[PDB]
Design a protein around this ligand. Structure first.
Ligand SMILES: Cn1ncc(C(=O)N2CCOCC2)c1C(=O)Nc1ccn2nc(N3CCCC3)nc2c1
Ligand SMILES: [Mg+2]
Ligand SMILES: [Zn+2]
Length: 313
C-alpha cells in the first residue's frame, strides 16, 4: 500500500525519455516494469503479489532467442510507458492497465521464426491460426497465464471491464503483426488528412492503439545509435537462422534472411526506415504530437545507416 518501487537516480530520470535502454541487468527488468505500471496507472491498479507472479510467469514463457526475448518484451513496454506519460489525458484507465500488459505479453513463446516460416514448415500453429499466426498464439498464451492460480491481475474489474481490457489486449497484440500495419497506417493517414479522425469513435481508437503498438514494437530504431546497431545484430541472428531453415526445406529465402547478403544490410535498413519506420513515427507524431522525439530519433538513425553506406562508419 505505502510501498513505492524506486530506481537509482540515472534510471529514475532517463526511464522517462523515449530513448531509454533498460540495460543488461536482467534481474532489474521486473522492477523497472512495476515502476512503470505504478507511475502510468497507480499503485492501486494491481495487487503487487499477483502482478509479481504474473511478471515472473510471463518471463518464464519467453524463450532464449537472440531478439524475440524477455528483454524485447520489457523494451516495448517501456516505449508504451513513454507514450502514455507524454499523453496523460488521452487514455482511459482500462487502456493504461491493458496496453503495458499487452506490450509485456506481445511476443509470448516466440520461437524466433516468422509467420511465413511456420506456414512453409506446416507447423501445427499455422493450421490453428491461418493469419497473424504467432500473434494469435501470443494472445492465447496471455489468456493462459492470466488463468493460472494467483495470476489474475484483473480480478478487481467487473465482468464487462474485464472483457473490455482483454479485448484491448487482443487487438493491441494482433496489431503487432507488421502485415496489418501498412493498411492500418494508410487508413489513419487519410482519416487525419480529411479531418474524419475521431478519438470518441471506438474503431478509430482501435487503429491509433494499433499504430502505437507498431511504434513500440519497432522502438530499437529510436534509440542511441550503438543500441540501434547492436539490436540489428540480434535481429539478423534470427533472420539468418530462419533463412538457413528455409534452405533446409529447399526454399531460397527472401534477402532479409539470407546470410549470403550480409553486404546489403545497410541498404535493407534504409528500405525499412523509408517503407516502415519513418511513415510509422510520422503518422504517430501527426496524431499524438508529444511523440515527436521518436520520429526525430528514427531520422537520426536513418542518417547513421546512410553514413555506413558512404564509408564514414
Ligand atoms: C530494425 N528493425 N526493427 C524491427 C525490424 C523488423 O522488421 N521486425 C522485427 C523482427 O520481426 C519482423 C519484424 C527491423 C528490421 O531490421 N527490419 C528489416 C526489414 C527489411 N529488411 N531487409 C533487409 N535486408 C538486408 C539485405 C537485403 C535486405 N534487412 C531488413 C530488416
Ligand atoms: Mg511479434
Ligand atoms: Zn515484438
Amino acid at each position: 500500500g505505502l510501498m513505492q518501487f524506486t530506481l537509482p537516480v540515472r534510471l529514475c530520470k532517463e526511464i522517462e525519455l523515449f530513448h531509454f535502454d533498460i540495460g543488461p541487468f536482467e534481474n532489474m527488468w521486473p522492477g523497472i516494469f512495476v515502476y512503470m505500471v505504478h507511475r502510468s496507472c497507480g499503485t492501486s491498479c494491481f495487487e503487487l503479489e499477483k502482478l509479481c507472479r504474473f511478471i515472473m510467469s510471463v518471463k518464464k514463457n519467453y524463450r532464449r532467442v537472440p531478439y524475440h526475448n524477455w528483454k524485447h518484451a520489457v523494451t516495448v513496454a517501456h516505449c508504451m510507458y513513454a507514450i502514455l506519460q507524454n499523453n496523460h489525458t488521452l487514455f482511459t484507465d482500462l487502456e493504461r492497465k491493458g496496453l503495458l500488459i499487452a506490450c509485456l505479453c506481445h511476443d509470448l513463446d516466440h520461437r524466433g521464426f516468422s509467420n511465413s516460416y511456420l506456414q512453409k514448415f506446416d507447423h501445427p500453429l499455422a493450421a490453428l491460426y491461418s493469419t497473424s499466426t504467432m500473434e494469435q498464439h501470443h494472445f492465447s498464451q496471455t489468456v493462459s497465464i492470466l488463468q493460472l492460480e494467483g495470476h489474475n491481475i484483473f480480478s478487481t474489474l467487473s465482468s464487462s471491464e474485464y472483457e473490455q481490457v482483454l479485448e484491448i489486449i487482443r487487438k493491441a497484440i494482433i496489431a503487432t503483426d507488421l502485415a496489418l500495419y501498412f493498411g492500418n497506417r494508410k487508413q489513419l493517414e487519410e482519416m487525419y488528412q480529411t479531418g474524419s479522425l475521431n478519438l470518441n469513435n471506438q474503431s478509430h481508437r482501435d487503429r491509433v492503439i494499433g499504430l502505437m503498438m507498431t511504434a513500440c514494437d519497432l522502438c530499437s530504431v529510436t534509440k542511441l545509435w550503438p543500441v540501434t546497431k547492436l539490436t540489428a545484430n540480434d535481429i539478423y541472428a534470427e533472420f539468418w537462422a530462419e533463412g538457413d531453415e528455409m534452405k533446409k526445406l529447399g526454399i531460397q529465402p527472401i534477402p532479409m534472411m539470407d546470410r549470403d547478403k550480409k553486404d546489403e544490410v545497410p541498404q535493407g535498413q534504409l528500405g525499412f526506415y523509408n517503407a516502415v519506420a519513418i511513415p510509422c513515427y510520422t503518422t504517430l507524431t501527426q496524431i499524438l504530437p508529444p511523440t515527436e522525439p521518436l520520429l526525430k530519433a528514427c531520422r537520426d538513425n536513418l542518417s547513421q545507416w546512410e553514413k555506413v553506406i558512404r564509408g564514414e562508419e
